């Protein structure tokens, strides 16, 4: 039922806040977006921009994906993001995360028709 595009929105879109600036944010969000269900997702980024702005990245700077595929795109502008990284002492199911805010260019992979983000590759 859940499309790749919907999964990208679930894992990575958080337009509601301008910057994920609670120290609790990743702990709460990693759980509520179901990224700690079968295991602690080791790293995940949330993007605090409009869906339209993030979708627009698929028409921006074409760059090589980490996996060597050619369908990745880097945002021309920096975007407000939050990096969530599993702590060294995090143990499933009690997944624990460090919350870090940044403004960085995002790199996403795009697929499909319509051509939309389906994977978050990197922030630079």
Ligand X SMILES: O=c1[nH]cnc2c1ncn2[C@@H]1O[C@H](COP(=O)(O)O)[C@@H](O)[C@H]1O
> How do strand 116-123 and strand 61-63 relate by DSSP bridges?
unpaired
Examine the residue annotation and report whether 48 is marked as an active-site residue of this protein: no
Residues 78-107 that bind ligand X (CB under 6 A): none
Distances, alpha carbon 46 to alpha carbons 17, 70, 74, in Å: 10, 23, 16
| Interatomic CA distance for residues 66 and 24, integer angstroms | 30
**Per CB under 6 A, 48 contacts ligand X:** no
Work out the angle at residue 36's Cα, subtended by the Cα atoms of residues 32 and 37, and round it to the nearest 5 degrees.
95
Residue closer to ligand X (CB basis): 56 or 98? 98
Q: Residues 100, 80: contact at Cβ < 8 Å?
A: no
Q: Which stretch binds ligand X (CB under 6 A): 25-33, 54-62, 90-98, 114-122?
A: 114-122
Examine the residue annotation and report whether 119 is marked as an active-site residue of this protein: yes
Q: Report in angstroms how near the CB of residue 67 gets to ligand X at its nearest.
A: 8
**Per CB under 6 A, 5 contacts ligand X:** no
Residue closer to ligand X (CB basis): 37 or 91? 37
Among 15, 60, 111, 115, interactor with ligand X by CB under 6 A = 111
């Amino acid at each position: 039922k859940e499309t790749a595009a919907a999964k990208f929105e679930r894992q990575h879109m958080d337009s509601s806040t301008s910057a994920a600036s609670s120290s609790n944010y990743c702990n709460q969000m990693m759980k509520s977006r179901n990224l700690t269900k079968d295991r602690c997702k080791p790293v995940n980024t949330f993007v605090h921009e409009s869906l339209a702005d993030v979708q627009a990245v698929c028409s921006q700077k074409n760059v090589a994906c980490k996996n060597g595929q050619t369908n990745c795109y880097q945002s021309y502008s920096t975007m407000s993001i939050t990096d969530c990284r599993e702590t060294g002492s995090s143990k499933y199911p009690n997944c624990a995360y460090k919350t870090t805010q940044a403004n960085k260019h995002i790199i996403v992979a795009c697929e499909g028709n319509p051509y939309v983000p389906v994977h978050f590759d990197a922030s630079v």
